[PDB]
Amino acid sequence: VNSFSGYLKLTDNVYIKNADIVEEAKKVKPTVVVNAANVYLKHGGGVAGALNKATNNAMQVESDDYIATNGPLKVGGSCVLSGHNLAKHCLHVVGPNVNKGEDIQLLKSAYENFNQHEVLLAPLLSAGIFGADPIHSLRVCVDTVRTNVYLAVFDKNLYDKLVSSFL
Ligand SMILES: OC[C@@H]1CCCN(c2ncnc3[nH]c4cc(F)ccc4c23)C1
């Protein structure tokens, strides 16, 4: 039993809710919140800008030190950093950005990072400003992630379409 509330169950291990991931993180304080990161960990907008703003820019300060030491992530890759006031840990995952021309096949590699964590609160990778089809992202999530994932979808209209079209 865990503290996630109001989710629709899609499969054995995938759950979905129309929610603001920032507000959901503030309430649940999950072990892991996933960020929709880019390779530079520049958290300017989308999910990343919102999560970083909620940490009062502490996420960005930590991220800048990470990049100065380690260099950029790979598209499809991830790193574990602090969750600050939102979660124990933040898993920064880089899905392909279609608006940069990145290969959508890398979306499966991106979701594989979730399997290193037993339970996660996450957004749909490569959705939103990353330019992928969120229906496709949900399908890849369900077919790739085997650990327990609680998906927060900010847009109510999109949430209803994702549920209604789910096979
Ligand atoms: O849904 C399409 C976009 C892009 C893909 C996923 N994004 C989110 N997903 C879950 N929670 C979210 N809180 C947010 C707060 C913001 F200021 C911006 C985006 C989100 C956000 C929204």
Side-chain angles (χ1 to χ4, degrees):
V1 173
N2 65 53
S3 154
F4 288 105
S5 178
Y7 287 74
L8 175 65
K9 182 171 181 58
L10 295 174
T11 68
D12 181 63
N13 65 298
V14 179
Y15 294 81
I16 195 166
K17 185 185 179 176
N18 174 215
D20 183 340
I21 192 170
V22 169
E23 278 319 299
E24 190 77 4
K26 282 198 291 188
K27 145 180 135 43
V28 175
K29 291 291 235 87
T31 305
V32 181
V33 65
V34 174
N35 182 32
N38 59 54
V39 297
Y40 307 110
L41 302 178
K42 285 174 59 102
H43 310 301
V47 169
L51 291 169
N52 176 59
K53 179 178 178 185
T55 75
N56 181 45
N57 211 50
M59 178 181 285
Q60 190 65 66
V61 169
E62 180 195 29
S63 292
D64 287 350
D65 171 83
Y66 173 92
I67 296 287
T69 298
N70 300 108
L73 296 181
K74 300 171 179 180
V75 179
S78 71
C79 67
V80 180
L81 291 172
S82 179
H84 300 278
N85 54 317
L86 303 179
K88 186 173 197 299
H89 302 108
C90 179
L91 181 70
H92 295 272
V93 180
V94 184
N97 190 325
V98 176
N99 305 315
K100 303 172 175 179
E102 294 165 351
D103 166 25
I104 194 62
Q105 298 307 136
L106 289 168
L107 186 54
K108 187 171 185 75
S109 302
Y111 274 116
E112 288 170 342
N113 296 287
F114 290 24
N115 290 321
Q116 300 294 317
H117 303 278
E118 288 189 10
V119 183
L120 315 87
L121 171 63
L124 285 170
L125 298 180
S126 296
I129 68 175
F130 281 63
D133 177 0
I135 297 180
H136 175 66
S137 182
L138 178 56
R139 187 77 255 166
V140 179
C141 181
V142 161
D143 293 341
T144 305
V145 182
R146 296 176 302 282
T147 55
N148 291 145
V149 57
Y150 289 84
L151 294 168
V153 177
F154 180 57
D155 190 70
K156 173 57 161 156
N157 188 293
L158 173 60
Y159 171 84
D160 286 348
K161 182 196 189 112
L162 285 167
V163 169
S164 291
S165 59
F166 183 70
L167 222 199

mmCIF file of all heavy atoms in Angstrom, residues 19-22 36 45-51 122-130 134 152-155 158, ligand 1:
data_model
loop_
_atom_site.group_PDB
_atom_site.id
_atom_site.type_symbol
_atom_site.label_atom_id
_atom_site.label_comp_id
_atom_site.label_asym_id
_atom_site.label_seq_id
_atom_site.Cartn_x
_atom_site.Cartn_y
_atom_site.Cartn_z
ATOM 1 N N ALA A 19 -3.287 15.626 -12.937
ATOM 2 C CA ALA A 19 -2.723 16.314 -11.785
ATOM 3 C C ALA A 19 -1.537 17.148 -12.236
ATOM 4 O O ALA A 19 -0.912 16.870 -13.266
ATOM 5 C CB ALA A 19 -2.324 15.327 -10.668
ATOM 6 N N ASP A 20 -1.250 18.183 -11.443
ATOM 7 C CA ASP A 20 -0.034 18.980 -11.567
ATOM 8 C C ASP A 20 1.072 18.231 -10.861
ATOM 9 O O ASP A 20 0.986 18.043 -9.643
ATOM 10 C CB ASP A 20 -0.280 20.336 -10.912
ATOM 11 C CG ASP A 20 0.888 21.299 -11.038
ATOM 12 O OD1 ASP A 20 2.023 20.858 -11.284
ATOM 13 O OD2 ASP A 20 0.656 22.519 -10.871
ATOM 14 N N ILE A 21 2.097 17.767 -11.614
ATOM 15 C CA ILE A 21 3.127 16.967 -10.914
ATOM 16 C C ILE A 21 3.762 17.713 -9.726
ATOM 17 O O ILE A 21 4.170 17.090 -8.738
ATOM 18 C CB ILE A 21 4.189 16.417 -11.901
ATOM 19 C CG1 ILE A 21 5.074 15.352 -11.224
ATOM 20 C CG2 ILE A 21 5.046 17.529 -12.499
ATOM 21 C CD1 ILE A 21 5.995 14.585 -12.182
ATOM 22 N N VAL A 22 3.869 19.027 -9.765
ATOM 23 C CA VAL A 22 4.450 19.770 -8.645
ATOM 24 C C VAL A 22 3.582 19.645 -7.399
ATOM 25 O O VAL A 22 4.080 19.412 -6.293
ATOM 26 C CB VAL A 22 4.610 21.243 -9.042
ATOM 27 C CG1 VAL A 22 4.957 22.088 -7.826
ATOM 28 C CG2 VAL A 22 5.641 21.376 -10.142
ATOM 29 N N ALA A 36 11.375 15.790 -16.519
ATOM 30 C CA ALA A 36 11.526 15.820 -17.972
ATOM 31 C C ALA A 36 12.701 16.730 -18.323
ATOM 32 O O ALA A 36 12.541 17.898 -18.693
ATOM 33 C CB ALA A 36 10.234 16.320 -18.604
ATOM 34 N N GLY A 45 11.627 25.365 -18.699
ATOM 35 C CA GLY A 45 10.209 25.375 -18.993
ATOM 36 C C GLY A 45 9.635 23.979 -18.953
ATOM 37 O O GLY A 45 10.321 23.009 -18.635
ATOM 38 N N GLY A 46 8.358 23.879 -19.292
ATOM 39 C CA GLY A 46 7.695 22.602 -19.197
ATOM 40 C C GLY A 46 7.693 22.103 -17.772
ATOM 41 O O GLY A 46 7.701 22.878 -16.803
ATOM 42 N N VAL A 47 7.697 20.771 -17.644
ATOM 43 C CA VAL A 47 7.770 20.134 -16.333
ATOM 44 C C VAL A 47 9.015 20.593 -15.578
ATOM 45 O O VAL A 47 8.962 20.857 -14.373
ATOM 46 C CB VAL A 47 7.701 18.596 -16.480
ATOM 47 C CG1 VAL A 47 8.041 17.881 -15.164
ATOM 48 C CG2 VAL A 47 6.311 18.149 -16.959
ATOM 49 N N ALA A 48 10.163 20.627 -16.259
ATOM 50 C CA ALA A 48 11.413 20.946 -15.568
ATOM 51 C C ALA A 48 11.393 22.367 -14.981
ATOM 52 O O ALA A 48 11.803 22.585 -13.836
ATOM 53 C CB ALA A 48 12.590 20.776 -16.535
ATOM 54 N N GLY A 49 10.979 23.359 -15.772
ATOM 55 C CA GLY A 49 10.868 24.719 -15.254
ATOM 56 C C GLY A 49 9.936 24.807 -14.064
ATOM 57 O O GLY A 49 10.207 25.545 -13.114
ATOM 58 N N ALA A 50 8.826 24.060 -14.099
ATOM 59 C CA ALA A 50 7.882 24.089 -12.989
ATOM 60 C C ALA A 50 8.460 23.424 -11.740
ATOM 61 O O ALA A 50 8.341 23.956 -10.631
ATOM 62 C CB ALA A 50 6.573 23.431 -13.417
ATOM 63 N N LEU A 51 9.076 22.243 -11.891
ATOM 64 C CA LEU A 51 9.702 21.594 -10.732
ATOM 65 C C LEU A 51 10.791 22.480 -10.150
ATOM 66 O O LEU A 51 10.869 22.672 -8.932
ATOM 67 C CB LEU A 51 10.277 20.214 -11.087
ATOM 68 C CG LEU A 51 9.274 19.098 -11.411
ATOM 69 C CD1 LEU A 51 9.994 17.893 -11.992
ATOM 70 C CD2 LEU A 51 8.455 18.708 -10.189
ATOM 71 N N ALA A 122 5.764 10.395 -12.098
ATOM 72 C CA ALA A 122 6.420 10.823 -13.325
ATOM 73 C C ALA A 122 5.467 11.519 -14.287
ATOM 74 O O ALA A 122 4.250 11.285 -14.260
ATOM 75 C CB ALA A 122 7.089 9.645 -14.039
ATOM 76 N N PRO A 123 6.013 12.339 -15.185
ATOM 77 C CA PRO A 123 5.279 12.810 -16.353
ATOM 78 C C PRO A 123 5.492 11.849 -17.518
ATOM 79 O O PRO A 123 6.376 10.997 -17.498
ATOM 80 C CB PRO A 123 5.993 14.132 -16.639
ATOM 81 C CG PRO A 123 7.447 13.792 -16.377
ATOM 82 C CD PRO A 123 7.420 12.815 -15.206
ATOM 83 N N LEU A 124 4.685 12.025 -18.556
ATOM 84 C CA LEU A 124 4.922 11.314 -19.805
ATOM 85 C C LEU A 124 6.153 11.875 -20.508
ATOM 86 O O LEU A 124 6.184 13.052 -20.886
ATOM 87 C CB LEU A 124 3.709 11.418 -20.715
ATOM 88 C CG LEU A 124 2.518 10.544 -20.328
ATOM 89 C CD1 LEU A 124 1.313 10.928 -21.146
ATOM 90 C CD2 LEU A 124 2.852 9.060 -20.512
ATOM 91 N N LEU A 125 7.157 11.024 -20.701
ATOM 92 C CA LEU A 125 8.401 11.462 -21.316
ATOM 93 C C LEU A 125 8.171 11.896 -22.760
ATOM 94 O O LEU A 125 7.398 11.289 -23.511
ATOM 95 C CB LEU A 125 9.444 10.338 -21.258
ATOM 96 C CG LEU A 125 9.868 9.871 -19.869
ATOM 97 C CD1 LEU A 125 10.891 8.760 -19.992
ATOM 98 C CD2 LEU A 125 10.449 11.008 -19.053
ATOM 99 N N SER A 126 8.879 12.947 -23.150
ATOM 100 C CA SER A 126 8.870 13.527 -24.484
ATOM 101 C C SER A 126 7.543 14.194 -24.848
ATOM 102 O O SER A 126 7.402 14.682 -25.975
ATOM 103 C CB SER A 126 9.331 12.541 -25.567
ATOM 104 O OG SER A 126 10.691 12.169 -25.352
ATOM 105 N N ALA A 127 6.591 14.274 -23.919
ATOM 106 C CA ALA A 127 5.344 14.980 -24.164
ATOM 107 C C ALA A 127 5.540 16.492 -23.990
ATOM 108 O O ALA A 127 6.653 16.991 -23.784
ATOM 109 C CB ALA A 127 4.242 14.406 -23.268
ATOM 110 N N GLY A 128 4.446 17.233 -24.090
ATOM 111 C CA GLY A 128 4.526 18.667 -23.885
ATOM 112 C C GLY A 128 5.478 19.317 -24.874
ATOM 113 O O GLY A 128 5.462 19.018 -26.078
ATOM 114 N N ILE A 129 6.332 20.208 -24.357
ATOM 115 C CA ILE A 129 7.251 20.960 -25.205
ATOM 116 C C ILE A 129 8.327 20.110 -25.862
ATOM 117 O O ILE A 129 9.051 20.626 -26.730
ATOM 118 C CB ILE A 129 7.860 22.173 -24.478
ATOM 119 C CG1 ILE A 129 8.810 21.737 -23.352
ATOM 120 C CG2 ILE A 129 6.754 23.079 -23.958
ATOM 121 C CD1 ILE A 129 9.541 22.904 -22.686
ATOM 122 N N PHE A 130 8.455 18.824 -25.486
ATOM 123 C CA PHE A 130 9.382 17.935 -26.180
ATOM 124 C C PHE A 130 8.818 17.416 -27.503
ATOM 125 O O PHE A 130 9.552 16.792 -28.272
ATOM 126 C CB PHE A 130 9.823 16.769 -25.274
ATOM 127 C CG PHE A 130 10.904 17.131 -24.268
ATOM 128 C CD1 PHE A 130 10.682 18.075 -23.282
ATOM 129 C CD2 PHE A 130 12.123 16.469 -24.283
ATOM 130 C CE1 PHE A 130 11.670 18.382 -22.355
ATOM 131 C CE2 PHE A 130 13.108 16.766 -23.355
ATOM 132 C CZ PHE A 130 12.881 17.724 -22.390
ATOM 133 N N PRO A 134 1.746 12.276 -27.008
ATOM 134 C CA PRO A 134 1.611 11.683 -25.663
ATOM 135 C C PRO A 134 0.940 10.316 -25.661
ATOM 136 O O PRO A 134 1.213 9.510 -24.770
ATOM 137 C CB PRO A 134 0.787 12.728 -24.894
ATOM 138 C CG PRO A 134 0.115 13.542 -25.948
ATOM 139 C CD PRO A 134 1.032 13.556 -27.123
ATOM 140 N N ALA A 152 1.386 11.646 -13.843
ATOM 141 C CA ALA A 152 0.645 12.881 -13.655
ATOM 142 C C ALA A 152 0.558 13.597 -14.996
ATOM 143 O O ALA A 152 1.586 13.903 -15.614
ATOM 144 C CB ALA A 152 1.345 13.750 -12.617
ATOM 145 N N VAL A 153 -0.663 13.859 -15.442
ATOM 146 C CA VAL A 153 -0.923 14.535 -16.705
ATOM 147 C C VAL A 153 -1.591 15.866 -16.390
ATOM 148 O O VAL A 153 -2.729 15.895 -15.903
ATOM 149 C CB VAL A 153 -1.795 13.688 -17.637
ATOM 150 C CG1 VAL A 153 -2.095 14.455 -18.892
ATOM 151 C CG2 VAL A 153 -1.093 12.365 -17.962
ATOM 152 N N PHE A 154 -0.894 16.963 -16.688
ATOM 153 C CA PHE A 154 -1.359 18.292 -16.290
ATOM 154 C C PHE A 154 -2.659 18.680 -16.989
ATOM 155 O O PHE A 154 -3.558 19.266 -16.370
ATOM 156 C CB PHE A 154 -0.267 19.309 -16.620
ATOM 157 C CG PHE A 154 -0.625 20.722 -16.261
ATOM 158 C CD1 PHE A 154 -0.978 21.040 -14.962
ATOM 159 C CD2 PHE A 154 -0.598 21.723 -17.216
ATOM 160 C CE1 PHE A 154 -1.302 22.334 -14.623
ATOM 161 C CE2 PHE A 154 -0.922 23.022 -16.883
ATOM 162 C CZ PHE A 154 -1.274 23.327 -15.582
ATOM 163 N N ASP A 155 -2.763 18.397 -18.283
ATOM 164 C CA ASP A 155 -3.885 18.871 -19.087
ATOM 165 C C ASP A 155 -5.070 17.909 -18.997
ATOM 166 O O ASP A 155 -4.961 16.743 -19.390
ATOM 167 C CB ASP A 155 -3.451 19.016 -20.539
ATOM 168 C CG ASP A 155 -4.492 19.725 -21.380
ATOM 169 O OD1 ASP A 155 -4.684 20.945 -21.184
ATOM 170 O OD2 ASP A 155 -5.135 19.072 -22.226
ATOM 171 N N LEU A 158 -6.149 16.355 -22.395
ATOM 172 C CA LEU A 158 -5.246 15.294 -22.810
ATOM 173 C C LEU A 158 -5.426 14.055 -21.947
ATOM 174 O O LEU A 158 -5.438 12.935 -22.469
ATOM 175 C CB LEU A 158 -3.806 15.790 -22.749
ATOM 176 C CG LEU A 158 -2.752 14.728 -23.003
ATOM 177 C CD1 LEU A 158 -2.920 14.126 -24.352
ATOM 178 C CD2 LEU A 158 -1.360 15.287 -22.843
HETATM 179 O O1 LIG B 1 1.118 17.866 -20.839
HETATM 180 C C1 LIG B 1 1.966 18.476 -21.770
HETATM 181 C C2 LIG B 1 3.145 19.265 -21.035
HETATM 182 C C3 LIG B 1 4.392 18.647 -21.381
HETATM 183 C C4 LIG B 1 4.497 17.283 -20.959
HETATM 184 C C5 LIG B 1 4.077 17.078 -19.501
HETATM 185 N N1 LIG B 1 3.846 18.359 -18.705
HETATM 186 C C6 LIG B 1 3.452 18.183 -17.322
HETATM 187 N N2 LIG B 1 3.090 16.974 -16.902
HETATM 188 C C7 LIG B 1 2.711 16.791 -15.643
HETATM 189 N N3 LIG B 1 2.680 17.787 -14.782
HETATM 190 C C8 LIG B 1 3.034 19.047 -15.144
HETATM 191 N N4 LIG B 1 3.082 20.210 -14.452
HETATM 192 C C9 LIG B 1 3.505 21.219 -15.253
HETATM 193 C C10 LIG B 1 3.711 22.593 -14.994
HETATM 194 C C11 LIG B 1 4.154 23.436 -16.005
HETATM 195 F F1 LIG B 1 4.352 24.760 -15.752
HETATM 196 C C12 LIG B 1 4.401 22.920 -17.280
HETATM 197 C C13 LIG B 1 4.198 21.568 -17.540
HETATM 198 C C14 LIG B 1 3.740 20.711 -16.509
HETATM 199 C C15 LIG B 1 3.432 19.286 -16.439
HETATM 200 C C16 LIG B 1 2.931 19.274 -19.516
#
